[PDB]
């Protein structure tokens, strides 16, 4: 089992992109299956659009500086672009392509592949961003530390001009995410105790959630499709759920037998119906609506939890499928 | 240490077949040893009969479509047959030979080697079958999903007369694993969720026992009966092997591999006849000797694990020894 | 992931120093963050004062003999000191600077940086030391092997630069030694690591004697709490024991996750008790109770956070885990 | 922690020879310490004489076919010899040097390095041979399978002529060893249940031992310095001791926490005195005579056990040190 290097959902949470030290894999979520795979080489960043057979490939060190755009259906390469420094993160929407380096952010037109604008930023060693996946409200945010610590620049990708600056947190920014419609924004400090939700249009603080009673760093934040829930994953092997309708709404407890040297991301999907007959041993109406939550870890396992939208509480685990196998 | 692509026991469980990316090997179980080996090439299917120096060899892709029958004692070639597509599974008894492609089933007479029958089935990308090894009750069962809830339909096919006998509505979801006892009396099936294990009586068709497996849904690798049909062994992605007692629900006894073992390992098992073991050497926790069922669990990483189960106590099983295949 | 060669807390346990094969890093503990870094080259010893932006850097070989002291806030160099032999250990307080070679000990004034004393000692291949960090009780202790009289330790007063007493600590060679924050106590352990003894540096009488583990296994480091309530020992057993000095057997023990490599150096520290929420953590209930935090860092590059119940003790729960390499 | 590829004692059992994928190390047993080390490369076989600063180096694949002899004190290279096939085993005494291949055995004069004799043998996939370490009775024993399975060829290295052929076992031979004085030979069958000890001079069967109630393969057999005890290590994580004064005399139980995917060898030393005061918890006459037993496993740990020469039974573990560190 070759070690994996990169895990990420798609912009909707219905697919899995995974990169190994030997190749890359593309999975699926509800009918869990192996969509694609290539044994080419080590891949450090694998980003996919809304299906559409579009992939972003970054070499492990193909080097870390080079970026390759490939089409899996045509088995051809769209373009290859190099950068002075190693690529830290890549995100996409249907109109723009964004490449982030330590001190620069590159913005491309996803159609013409022509360079549009370049932003000179203060160094970001963590490769942090958050990008709105909807073209209607295409906004980009990125932290602006002094060379006043949690200032994030709200950048309008449509007109290529910044719009406003919000003083998010007093300390260094640890994680950011933007809803599917590009309306709301979420931030988390390095303390991992305070979650703040901002409105991009105005900049007002909308919500504030408490989490992480002890020192557990926050890794990733994700919005649900309807923006009803916000999921944060940390190093504590627990994932909390906040409702955007204080205390966390629900919590995910991974099984203890799992590896502890894991980094877990999460993505809450649209509510679906589950069959109770398939699972007699746990959780025992033939079918009831349950919101699915997908947590993939760096050890190579995908998990599916479900939460009752009324009770909340701890969420049951339905399946544990073995990626990479 | 070359990678291994295929492991299975013989129809009696007293031998080991194995296929690497460089060749194939044949082992033995009780007086452990390496009977045969060739560093020819990549092998994906290495299936053996009841000893008898008969093998089925499929190249990794010797293409994947080609099937070659080799007598290891004579070092000769009985025959060579090609197929339009890659072979997914091969099984034998002392009467018939079955080759499965993704949508076709070929049945051959083991002696004359002439083709006897062909079955056009709905696609099976998983290459799932189950073959009864006894000629008295020679049966073949293969899944029949609808062609695009009744997705888990399986076809009970009689090899002797080459006519299907009945259709079993096994499960609601797709079938994931099938196993037939040594005498061809029972058949066990597993859905893709691996939560419910169902065993059917092949002659009558009635479901006799239904087992719940684990706590949450997870993939199942293989199922196998005991020689005397007393116990049933299932192995899954939870790195745990369960034993269900068919002497008649919850698993009777569970096999926990050592913690250092990799979690992403294909694990197949087998159950042998009870033997006498000395309790003086092994503090089971006492009469000097007590019968304990030996279990052999070989994993895709290349190791063999020997366990013992107490038929009355059951429960968690002790591990005696560990070898290392390929060494 | 670059290979790391050096990990140490500050004198208060609220910071992390570290040295890689490519440079050194400085972290923090409660609001975890990377205060400083530098990609110069191989660093073997990185010692820090009570914050205050003062560092001592020893290259892996900047040769191993050379000592360089740097102020990180000003990014300037105070001075560089060369030695005939490679440096084995460096410890500081806000009054004195101490450099150990295998047979020589050098003492510097941290303020004026002028040489004050030099002690010709018998060889110490392990570079062992313990230094009181408080100027009110500035003491230095180092082993004195002969050239059975093997575990003799010289109690050296840094304030007046004269030895105070000789401690007949152990029958065999000393393996590790530490001094409380206030400079009152001293704890030493022999190379077998089976007996932990605590002596009062004021008089020299043995106060506490603790047994560690069953069989003789190596000990890496010993450290007191800031309030001198507990003592922490780390060894090759991949387990960390805590001995309660509020007063034999260890009071509470720390077990790393089984996945952790067993060949890892581990240093630990105990912090002041703080409030934790029992609502979030099922300790198995008042909403909050004071838990003593323990931070354990391993040579593989991970940090572990435990909590200890001063009354219950026992096996300690683990809350979180980070990575010190990358982030 | 780099993986190791070779672990073995010296001819007296007072040292540890160990070679990793990055280099090789030389340890000691009673005053535990790291005598020597070099980070040169992968080494497959590192064999040492009776101290004397003499080593043999076999590359992992330096190739596996090539053999190099070095002197660690002078840091020089004596000679280098290549073979048509990979080297399977090397053993040495104060008079002869022998290199074993798949189907050939090479015999060298340890002083001159000149070739003396070459034996054409039936294939030995396990690389099995045993040498008497004393020049007084310099013998070599190797199995002779048919191309009548456990035939062992007693080859006299003194005059370069075979002496006699012993029908040792009906099945394949699994392990062979020769006492320090070269008087006795011990063998174990492939089923690993019966031990047979032969007089190398006449060929009479003297002793027969029972071991391995279930199928646990026997890996290594070793004599004590005085040949009073025989140590057998198998795959069962338990080591048996037989007395050459039937049932086993004493047994060694490694701690359960240890890795099970390990290969363990052992060697018994001369009786010594141990101090009770050093070990307060276990084993509590300030000093007692206890026969030391040293077991090293491939996971990188050296274990020391002690047995009471009268009672026997399960043996205590005094210490567990960590090789590679």
DSSP string, A184-247: EEEEEETTSSEEEEEETTT--EEEEEE--SSS--EEEEEE-TTSSEEEEEESSSEEEEEE----
Task: Choose the closest CB to D324 out of C190, C195, C263.
Answer: C263
Using CA atoms, how far residue C228 sits from C13, C203, C224, C252, C270, in Å, is 13, 18, 6, 16, 10
- Chain B contact probe: residue of A278, A318, A321 with most B CBs at under 10 A: A278
Please name which of D161, D159, D202, D208 lies closest in space to residue D188, comparing C-alpha atoms: D208
Six token digits for residue B182: 């040594």
8 Å CB contact between B153 and B169: yes
C192 touching D, CB under 8 A?
Answer: yes
CA distance D259 to D254: 10
8 Å CB contact between C116 and C161: yes
Q: What is the 3-state secondary structure (H, E, C) of B173-225?
A: CCEEEEEECCCCCEEEEEECCCCEEEEEECCCCCEEEEEECCCCECCEEEEEE
Give strand pairing partners of D136.
Answer: none
Helix (H, G, I), strand (E, B) or coil at C53: coil
CA distance B248 to B94: 30
- B321/D216 CB distance under 8 A: yes
Beta strands at D76-81 and D67-71: parallel, antiparallel or unpaired? antiparallel
**Cα of C301 to nearest chain D Cα, Å:** 13
C22 touching D, CB under 8 A?
Answer: no
Secondary structure (DSSP) of B46-87: EEEESEEEEEEEEE----SS-EEEEETTTTEEEEEE--SS--
CA distance C145 to A324: 57
CA distance C157 to C93: 13
- C215/D278 CB distance under 8 A: no
Six token digits for residue B315: 């429960």
Half-sphere exposure of D99 (CA within 13 A, CB side): 28
Resolution given for this structure, in angstroms: 3.3
CA distance C307 to D260: 31
Phi, psi of C326 (to 5 degrees): 45, -130
- B323/D217 CB distance under 8 A: yes
Give strand pairing partners of D17.
Answer: D8, D26
8 Å CB contact between B172 and A277: yes
The number of angstroms, rounded, from the C-alpha of B307 to the middle of its chain's C-alpha atoms is 18
Beta strands at A272-275 and A301-307: parallel, antiparallel or unpaired? unpaired
Task: Choose the closest CB to D320 out of C217, C261, C263.
Answer: C217
Six token digits for residue D243: 């007395």
8 Å CB contact between C131 and C93: yes
After which residues is the backbone of chain D broken at C–N > 2.5 Å?
A: 61, 147, 245, 284
Contacts of A236 in chain C (CB under 8 A): 319-320
CA distance D44 to D290: 34
CA distance A186 to A178: 6
Six token digits for residue A73: 């259906």
Please name which of D170, D178, D196 lies closest in space to residue D142, comparing C-alpha atoms: D178
Residues of C233-251 as b/e, b for ≥16 C-beta within 10 angstroms?
bbbbbbbbbbbbbeeeebb
Q: If you ran DSSP here, which 8-state letter would residue C105 be given?
A: E
What Rg value do the Cα atoms of chain A yield, rounded? 19
Phi, psi of D78 (to 5 degrees): -75, -55
Angle at B203 between CA B198 and CA B207, to 5 degrees: 25
Six token digits for residue C216: 């003789």
- C194/D281 CB distance under 8 A: yes
Six token digits for residue B52: 């008898």
In A12-95, the DSSP E strands lie at: 15-20, 24-28, 34-38, 43-48, 54-59, 67-71, 76-81, 89-92
Task: Choose the closest CB to A324 out of B173, B215, B264.
Answer: B264
Using CA atoms, how far residue A294 sits from A187, A318, A320, in Å, is 21, 10, 10
Six token digits for residue C2: 């670059």
CA distance B306 to B319: 6
CA distance D15 to D323: 12
Please name which of B19, B123, B97 lies closest in space to residue B61, comparing C-alpha atoms: B19
CA distance B249 to B197: 9
Half-sphere exposure of C180 (CA within 13 A, CB side): 20
Please name which of B20, B21, B29, B70 lies closest in space to residue B48, comparing C-alpha atoms: B70
CA distance B184 to A26: 41
Q: How many residues does chain B have?
A: 327
Q: Which residues contact A309 (CB under 8 A, 6 or more apart)?
A: A271, A289, A291
Residues of A162-181 as b/e, b for ≥16 C-beta within 10 angstroms?
eeeebebbeebbbbbbbbbe
Angle at A82 between CA A81 and CA A84, to 5 degrees: 150
Give strand pairing partners of D114.
Answer: none
Residue D61: how many other CB atoms lie within 10 Å: 11
Give me the total of CB pairs closer than 8 Å, taking one residue from chain A and one from chain C.
44
Six token digits for residue C131: 């230094």
Task: Choose the closest CB to D319 out of C172, C215, C262.
Answer: C215
- Nearest-by-CA chain C residue for D302: C217
8 Å CB contact between B269 and B233: yes
Beta strands at C139-143 and C151-157: parallel, antiparallel or unpaired? antiparallel
Beta strands at A54-59 and A67-71: parallel, antiparallel or unpaired? antiparallel
Please name which of B76, B83, B75, B136 lies closest in space to residue B108, comparing C-alpha atoms: B83
8 Å CB contact between C37 and C24: yes
Taking the C-alpha atoms of C2, C7, C12 and C13 in order, what is their torsion angle to the nearest 10 degrees?
70
Q: If you ran DSSP here, which 8-state letter would residue A267 be given?
A: E
CA distance B214 to B223: 15
Q: Which residues contact C238 (CB under 8 A, 6 or more apart)?
A: C255, C256, C260, C262, C264, C266
Helix (H, G, I), strand (E, B) or coil at C284: coil
Beta strands at A130-131 and A139-143: parallel, antiparallel or unpaired? antiparallel
Q: Which sign, positive or negative, has the C-alpha torsion C254, C255, C259, C260? A: positive
CA distance A226 to D170: 76
Q: Spell out the long-range contacts of A15-18 with Cβ–Cβ below 8 A and sequence spacing 24 or more.
A: A15/A48, A15/A51, A16/A296, A16/A302, A16/A323, A17/A46, A17/A47, A17/A48, A17/A55, A18/A46, A18/A296, A18/A323, A18/A324
**Cα of C25 to nearest chain D Cα, Å:** 22
- A282/B216 CB distance under 8 A: yes
Task: Choose the closest CB to A280 out of B195, B237, B263.
Answer: B195
What Rg value do the Cα atoms of chain B yield, rounded? 19
Six token digits for residue D237: 């994580």
The number of angstroms, rounded, from the C-alpha of D229 to the middle of its chain's C-alpha atoms is 14
Residue A217: how many other CB atoms lie within 10 Å: 21
C286 touching A, CB under 8 A?
Answer: no
Half-sphere exposure of A249 (CA within 13 A, CB side): 18
The number of angstroms, rounded, from the C-alpha of C64 to the middle of its chain's C-alpha atoms is 20
**Cα of A316 to nearest chain B Cα, Å:** 9
What Rg value do the Cα atoms of chain D yield, rounded? 19
Residues of D89-104 as b/e, b for ≥16 C-beta within 10 angstroms?
bbbbbeebbbbbbeee
B322 touching D, CB under 8 A?
Answer: yes
For chain C, list the contacting chains (3+ Cβ pairs, <8 Å): A, D
Contacts of A260 in chain C (CB under 8 A): 257, 259, 321
What Rg value do the Cα atoms of chain C yield, rounded? 19
The number of angstroms, rounded, from the C-alpha of D144 to the middle of its chain's C-alpha atoms is 20
Using CA atoms, how far residue D250 sits from B211, C53, C140, in Å, is 45, 61, 49
- Nearest-by-CA chain A residue for C261: A261
Residues of B238-271 as b/e, b for ≥16 C-beta within 10 angstroms?
bbbbbbbbbeeeebbbbbebeeebebbbbbbbbb
Six token digits for residue B91: 């099984």
8 Å CB contact between C238 and C262: yes
Residue A72: how many other CB atoms lie within 10 Å: 17
Please indicate whether chains B and A are in contact, defined as at least 3 beta carbon pairs under 8 Å.
yes
- Chain C contact probe: residue of A213, A253, A259, A262 with most C CBs at under 10 A: A213
- B322/D260 CB distance under 8 A: yes
**Cα of A215 to nearest chain C Cα, Å:** 7
Helix (H, G, I), strand (E, B) or coil at A109: strand
Give strand pairing partners of D29.
Answer: none
Please name which of C183, C110, C95, C174 lies closest in space to residue C142, comparing C-alpha atoms: C174
CA distance C315 to D82: 57
CA distance D168 to D95: 27
Q: If you ran DSSP here, which 8-state letter would residue B135 be given?
A: S
8 Å CB contact between D91 and D108: no
A76 touching C, CB under 8 A?
Answer: no
Give strand pairing partners of A56.
Answer: A47, A69
CA distance C138 to C117: 15
Angle at C154 between CA C149 and CA C158, to 5 degrees: 175
Residue A285: how many other CB atoms lie within 10 Å: 4
Helix (H, G, I), strand (E, B) or coil at A276: helix
Six token digits for residue D179: 């006492």
A216 touching C, CB under 8 A?
Answer: yes
Backbone torsion region of residue C26, taken as left when φ is above 0, otherwise alpha when ψ lies between -120 and 50, otherwise beta: beta
Residue with tokens 């294939």: D123
CA distance C293 to C322: 15
B171 exposure class (CB count in 10 Å sphere: 0-12, 13-18, 19+): buried
Six token digits for residue C266: 């581990």
Six token digits for residue D287: 């000093």
Q: Which residues contact C190 (CB under 8 A, 6 or more apart)?
A: C151, C170, C171, C172, C173, C174, C175, D278
The number of angstroms, rounded, from the C-alpha of C78 to the middle of its chain's C-alpha atoms is 25
C260 touching D, CB under 8 A?
Answer: no
Residues of C108-143 as b/e, b for ≥16 C-beta within 10 angstroms?
bebeeeeeebebebeebeeebbbbbbbeebbbbbbb
CA distance A135 to A156: 11
Using CA atoms, how far residue D137 sits from D52, D131, D180, in Å, is 21, 10, 10
8 Å CB contact between B188 and B182: no
D261 touching B, CB under 8 A?
Answer: yes
Please name which of C323, C278, C285 lies closest in space to residue C304, comparing C-alpha atoms: C323
Residue with tokens 């849904």: B217
Question: First vs last Cα of chain A: how many Å apart?
Answer: 8
D203 exposure class (CB count in 10 Å sphere: 0-12, 13-18, 19+): middle
Using CA atoms, how far residue B319 sits from A80, B177, B254, B264, D232, in Å, is 55, 26, 12, 20, 20
Q: What is the 3-state secondary structure (H, E, C) of chain D?
A: CCCEEEEEECCCCCEEEEEECCCEEEEECCCCCEEEEECCCCEEEEEECCCCCEEEEEECCCCCCCEEEEECCCCEEEEEECCCCCCCEEEECCCEEEEECCCEEEEEECCCCCEEEEEECCCCCCCCCEECCCHHHCEEEEECCCCCCEEEEEEECCCCEEEEEEEEECCCEEEEEECCCCCEEEEEECCCCEEEEEECCCCCEEEEEECCCCCCCEEEEEECCCCCEEEEEECCCEEEEEECCCCCCEEEECCCCCCCCCCEEEEECCCEEEECCCCCCCCCCCEEEEEEEEEEECCCEEEEEEECCCCCEECEEEEEEECCC
Q: How many residues does chain C have?
A: 327
8 Å CB contact between B66 and B57: no
Angle at B19 between CA B13 and CA B22, to 5 degrees: 155
């Amino acid at each position: 089992s070759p070690t994996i290097n990169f895990i990420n959902f798609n912009q909707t949470g219905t697919c899995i992109s995974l990169g190994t030290s030997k190749g890359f894999k593309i999975f699926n979520c509800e009918p869990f299956g192996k969509f694609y795979s290539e044994d080419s080489g080590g891949y450090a960043i694998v980003e996919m659009l809304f299906s559409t057979s579009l992939l972003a490939l970054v070499g492990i060190g193909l080097s870390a500086a080079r970026l390759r755009i490939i089409n899996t259906k045509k088995h051809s390469i769209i373009c290859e672009v190099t950068f002075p420094t190693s690529i830290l993160s890549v995100k996409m929407n249907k109109s723009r392509l964004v490449v982030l380096l330590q001190e620069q952010i590159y913005i491309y037109d996803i159609n013409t592949m022509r360079l549009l604008h370049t932003i000179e930023t203060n160094p970001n060693p963590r490769g942090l961003m958050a990008m709105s996946p909807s073209v209607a409200n295409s906004y980009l945010v990125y932290p602006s530390p002094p060379k006043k610590n949690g200032d994030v620049i709200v950048f309008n990708l449509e007109t290529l001009q910044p719009t406003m600056v919000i003083e998010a947190h007093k300390g260094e920014i640890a994680a950011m995410a933007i809803s599917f419609d590009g309306t709301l924004m979420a931030t988390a400090s390095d303390k991992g105790t305070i979650i703040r939700v901002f409105d991009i249009e105005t900049g007002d603080k909308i919500y504030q959630f408490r989490r992480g009673t002890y020192a557990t760093r926050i890794y990733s934040i994700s919005f649900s499709e309807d923006s009803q829930y916000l999921a944060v994953t940390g190093s504590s092997k627990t994932v909390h759920i906040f409702k955007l309708g204080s205390r966390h709404f629900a919590s995910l407890k991974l099984p203890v037998e799992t590896n502890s040297h894991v980094m877990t991301i999460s993505s809450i999907g649209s509510p679906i119906d589950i069959d109770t007959s398939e699972y007699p041993e746990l959780f025992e109406e033939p079918v009831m609506k349950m919101v699915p939550i997908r947590v993939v870890s760096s050890d190579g396992y995908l998990y599916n939890f479900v939460m009752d939208p009324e009770r909340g509480g701890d969420c049951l685990i339905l399946s544990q499928y073995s990626i990479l196998m």
